[PDB]
Amino acid sequence: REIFNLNEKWAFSKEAIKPPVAMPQNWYWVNLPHTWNAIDGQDGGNDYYRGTCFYAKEVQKEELPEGEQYYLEFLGVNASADVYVNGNHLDHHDGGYSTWRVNMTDALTDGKNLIVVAVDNSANDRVYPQKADFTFYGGMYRDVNIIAVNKSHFDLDYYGGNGLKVTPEVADKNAKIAVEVFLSGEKAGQQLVYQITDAEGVLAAETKTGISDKQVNLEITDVHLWNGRKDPYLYTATVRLMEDGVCIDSVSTRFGCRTFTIDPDKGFFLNGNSYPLRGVSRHQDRAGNGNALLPEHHREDIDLICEMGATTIRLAHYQHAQYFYDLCDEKGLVLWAEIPYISQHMKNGRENTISQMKELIVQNYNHPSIVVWGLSNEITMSGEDLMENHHILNDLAHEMDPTRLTTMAVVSMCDMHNPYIQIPDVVSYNHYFGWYGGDTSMNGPWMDEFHKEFPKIPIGMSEYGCEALNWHTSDPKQGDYTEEYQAHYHEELIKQLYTRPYIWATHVWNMFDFAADARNEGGENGMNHKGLVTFDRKYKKDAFYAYKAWLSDEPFVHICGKRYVDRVENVTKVTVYSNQKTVELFANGESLGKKEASDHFFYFEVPNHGETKLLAVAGECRDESFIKKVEKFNEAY
Numbered sequence: 001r002e003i004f005n006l007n008e009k010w011a012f013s014k015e016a017i018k019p020p021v022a023m024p025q026n027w028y029w030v031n032l033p034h035t036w037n038a039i040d041g042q043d044g045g046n047d048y049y050r051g052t053c054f055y056a057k058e059v060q061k062e063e064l065p066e067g068e069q070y071y072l073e074f075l076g077v078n079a080s081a082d083v084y085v086n087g088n089h090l091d092h093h094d095g096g097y098s099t100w101r102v103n104m105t106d107a108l109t110d111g112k113n114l115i116v117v118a119v120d121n122s123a124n125d126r127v128y129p130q131k132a133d134f135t136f137y138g139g140m141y142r143d144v145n146i147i148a149v150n151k152s153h154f155d156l157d158y159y160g161g162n163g164l165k166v167t168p169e170v171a172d173k174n175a176k177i178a179v180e181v182f183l184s185g186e187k188a189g190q191q192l193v194y195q196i197t198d199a200e201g202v203l204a205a206e207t208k209t210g211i212s213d214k215q216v217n218l219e220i221t222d223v224h225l226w227n228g229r230k231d232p233y234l235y236t237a238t239v240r241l242m243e244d245g246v247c248i249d250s251v252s253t254r255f256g257c258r259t260f261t262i263d264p265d266k267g268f269f270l271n272g273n274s275y276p277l278r279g280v281s282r283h284q285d286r287a288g289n290g291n292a293l294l295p296e297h298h299r300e301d302i303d304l305i306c307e308m309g310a311t312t313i314r315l316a317h318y319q320h321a322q323y324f325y326d327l328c329d330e331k332g333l334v335l336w337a338e339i340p341y342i343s344q345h346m347k348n349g350r351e352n353t354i355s356q357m358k359e360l361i362v363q364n365y366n367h368p369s370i371v372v373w374g375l376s377n378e379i380t381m382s383g384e385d386l387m388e389n390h391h392i393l394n395d396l397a398h399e400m401d402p403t404r405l406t407t408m409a410v411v412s413m414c415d416m417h418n419p420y421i422q423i424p425d426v427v428s429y430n431h432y433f434g435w436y437g438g439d440t441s442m443n444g445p446w447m448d449e450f451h452k453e454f455p456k457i458p459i460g461m462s463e464y465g466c467e468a469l470n471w472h473t474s475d476p477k478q479g480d481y482t483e484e485y486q487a488h489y490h491e492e493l494i495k496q497l498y499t500r501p502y503i504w505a506t507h508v509w510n511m512f513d514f515a516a517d518a519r520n521e522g523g524e525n526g527m528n529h530k531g532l533v534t535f536d537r538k539y540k541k542d543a544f545y546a547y548k549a550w551l552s553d554e555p556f557v558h559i560c561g562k563r564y565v566d567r568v569e570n571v572t573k574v575t576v577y578s579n580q581k582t583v584e585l586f587a588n589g590e591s592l593g594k595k596e597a598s599d600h601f602f603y604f605e606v607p608n609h610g611e612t613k614l615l616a617v618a619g620e621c622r623d624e625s626f627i628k629k630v631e632k633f634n635e636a637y
């Protein structure tokens, strides 16, 4: 079997209202990954086009790698899609975040073949998401491939899966790696080779049965445990369908060996040691590109999430790209993965929650980095049909993956005695005490109250955050949109949450600025600015380095306020962050004192006369900053 990438040069139309009978020579050319909302999804004004758009491409059978059956494979098509080959309506899909496939064989022909995909991201009441903050960028925003495979092949039609279910069970210093495969149109004479391989190639187990024994058990002696960032060891499982001696089909995946529990009082546990989960959420979009991300974009985000020392990532509010999950395995991050069951329960949305949950688990089951499954997000504020839906999903996730735990994110206002909170295995809350009213000191006591009233329900914070742009102040107060208040906000939240073992996970909202076309706030439109890093990933806000001081074992020092250069005071309050014991702040070469801090937030008092080149040393590490004295409060702040 071979794969034929089908990204290059599609004919696109926002104008057409019916699939073309014949290949348009008249349309606009796009390469995948593509989106028609990369521009009007990020400039605001609640105006981004939502509707049906059409893609059309021609491929010649003689140009494909040869196999007995042909599949179109979509890694991402937001939100709903209809596929046509040569005018024949082949399939239909609802869900912009999961992978799905269409068997082309009977409609393919010789000579030129016309493929048309009718993509739609319009409001309806059936397909989540519909009410949400983020922009639902329309279009084929991830890869499209043609799969050429034998008539006997590992399953390609069950909810986007591979037909490879690897389930490690750790037994003492050995692990038992159960391996189930699913086959389409297999025939009687066939056989199945199974192999696990080392991180450096070496074979580790192997079995071969006839095509009847779809389930096998292989064991690794002295297993190399995938154990978070510490040592994110990954094995590879691989299975080969063999007819006679030839290897006619093959399917592989990477995977990790670990156990984990969530203790209501002592937090999250990875392989029997307390492994506190302190991290961020992430959206799958970016300045300029919209949600049509390239592989280096996925890698750019990880490096910054990693440099900060996050240990967990909530991948809200939908299924992300496999290449992103793959990275999360490779670096040992602990993942929350969910479906867009968000904002408002839709009665005619039930069938679709079920399929996005089925797709989510089938396609991600082997990712050692996923430890929970998200049922919903901010789905209601009150104290019934919503309830039975939540049961179906929960029952489902447990019926399919009893090796992982269900969670959900609850809106701040929802009374903790709402029965639907009793459904998942764990719970987190989305609280903004200190941004949307309240004061930043309510967060710690709020989790204290949930823990008392419900001591057996592990409680987390799945969302918390505060907006920041390139505004500044020396009186930082909630609502001024300044980088300074966001530093303080997060300083305050870190002191209250990282110091409470029972909180099983904290997930900043959000790691990155992202596009929300309806918002008008801050001084830039259609943007949610609660990120720790800017939309184009090029700027790390000061808040980012507050978290580094607690989470990262890479030594560093960071002066805050580098962008607040002109200041109207006589002595100015410059915070510094570090994960070193003692830091010293210099003003034009003169020391101001050796301070030490338990919360890693060193505060300082700098006399502000003329130009003052500031320097901070902390062991090996050094960081420069500059300042000036004016009496006109510079109004670009």
Ligand SMILES: Cc1cc2nc3c(=O)[nH]c(=O)nc-3n(C[C@H](O)[C@H](O)[C@H](O)COP(=O)(O)O)c2cc1C
Residues within 6 Å of the ligand: 155, 158, 161, 162, 163, 164, 165, 182, 183, 361, 362, 363, 365, 400, 401
């Ligand atoms: C991770 C995972 C992957 C699965 N992949 C397949 C598959 O590729 N093909 C298949 O027939 N069943 C697969 N299954 C099993 C089905 O879920 C199972 O047969 C189920 O009972 C079918 O019920 P349904 O028709 O309502 O989906 C998989 C199960 C899990 C947990």
Ligand SMILES: [Ca+2]
Residues within 6 Å of the ligand: 039, 040, 041, 042, 043, 044, 045, 046, 047, 048, 517, 526
């Ligand atoms: Ca817009």
